[PDB]
């Protein structure tokens, strides 16, 4: 049967083509994950249909209800057969779905509006004039929450009680906040998005310091899925033959606007 | 039963303590992987015994005999229950044993003796005065062999026919060759070892350019192993709680001699 792929609109992984209203099926989308999905299906011998996750979320479990939302939820409840998106491999998600080995490596980073007097997380922790936060859901927020690490602890304690909220709903919101806060807001996000945005007009943002940790994005399938093993080998095969780095340069730097 | 862990002597992952002749059991060893093994066993609730792989190899399959050697072979033939070492996650190995998600991220890098007029793989490819090669077995050699990539292809073609051989048997051999060749030999090795050696006396080596690819080291277990699932979750748990980065700084930079 045709494999149902769930994904999410996040640049430059999956984006609607400018003329999407005139197209149908998979041709309506473009991006790193759209190309990766084609390669995975090709190497695994299956036909597929790209779909955008119904609730527009990545995947977290609600306290109290214990229900999984986002792409993870669609896999958990059988609404989709595979998730191909910038879904960070985490302990809680690994417990309910299967992840392929990383197709992309990344780490938590700091985004500032050019000119902001901040060079590291250390600088952020030892001050409050410049507010800073993470996405309101996701692996970055969890990193600070579970962090023994010192400077990261002063940061989580600060972010948790900061008013107004320093957390943003999406990457677009965090970037807009950095750009419109005249240097008074720094956004903690994954290096992949940071590096991408740095090469997009208005070219007014910058990634500072080194990554705070090392993690990866993985292709997800429901536990005990037949396609799981084949997809994992496909990711390794594509990475070893340079397809993945070629794909990143295509969507990150070949398209640089700065 | 006590879990048999197979590992390999590779600095600073596993090293014999200076006074090892006076110790017994696991206390004879020290290093990043020795500490990681303790953490994995603790989080997985098992007793273990560290052993050094009999043939002193990582794991490759012989053509003609089709027999697996090294740590991979010990897992494949049931001589060990788990491998905890800087074993690169690769397609061919993933097909015969199970790998946990990466406990360390790395990429192929270039090591030169300080002063060598080389800054990138591109520089290496467009010349021959300065010889360069990889370890005679392993994932780095395979990267160049399977590389479509252009400059990397000119490099593999050159390395394959270069005389005398530009390939080295071990990290120690590659480093000794770089140090004793008066700038006429550059070694292609994993960034982890490169970064480590750069901070070790004589402090005469340097890592140049950016990594050529992105890969990781994983903990290995025989296929269908009971411990596999638990070990994978332990790696993710330890990484999220900062144990892994803390462990890398302990063995890489806290001990810097330069
Ligand atoms: C864009 C979002 C909400 C994602 C993408 N990867 C992370 C995840 O899969 O949780 C989230 C980012 C972050 O947490 O910084
Ligand atoms: C040190 C050795 C021989 C190893 C360690 N990781 C790689 C592996 O697991 O193949 C090899 C290095 C390399 O290929 O550059």
Polypeptide structure, described:
The structure is a homodimer of 258-residue chains. With 258 residues, the first copy, chain A, is of the alpha/beta class. Helix content of chain A is 35%, strand content 18%. Chain A is built from ten helices and 13 strands. Chain A has helices spanning 32-44, 70-76, 91-94, 121-125, 139-146, 151-161, 171-180, 191-198, 227-240, 243-252; strands spanning 3-7, 15-16, 29-30, 48-52, 82-83, 97-99, 104-106, 108-113, 131-133, 185-190, 205-208, 215-217, 220-222. In chain A, the strands form five sheets. The first copy, chain A, has a four-stranded mixed beta sheet with strand order 9-10-8-11. Chain A is globular and about 55 Å long. One 3-(carboxymethyl)-4-isopropenylproline (KAI) binds next to helix 5 and strand 10 of chain B. The site of one 3-(carboxymethyl)-4-isopropenylproline has 12 residues of chain A, from helix 5 and strand 10. Chains A, B: It is found in: Cell membrane; Postsynaptic cell membrane; Postsynaptic density membrane.
Write the layout of secondary structure elements.
Two copies of one chain form a homodimer.
Chain A: E1 3-7, E2 15-16, E3 29-30, H1 32-44, E4 48-52, H2 70-76, E5 82-83, H3 91-94, E6 97-99, E7 104-106, E8 108-113, H4 121-125, E9 131-133, H5 139-146, H6 151-161, H7 171-180, E10 185-190, H8 191-198, E11 205-208, E12 215-217, E13 220-222, H9 227-240, H10 243-252
Bound molecules: 3-(carboxymethyl)-4-isopropenylproline (2 copies).
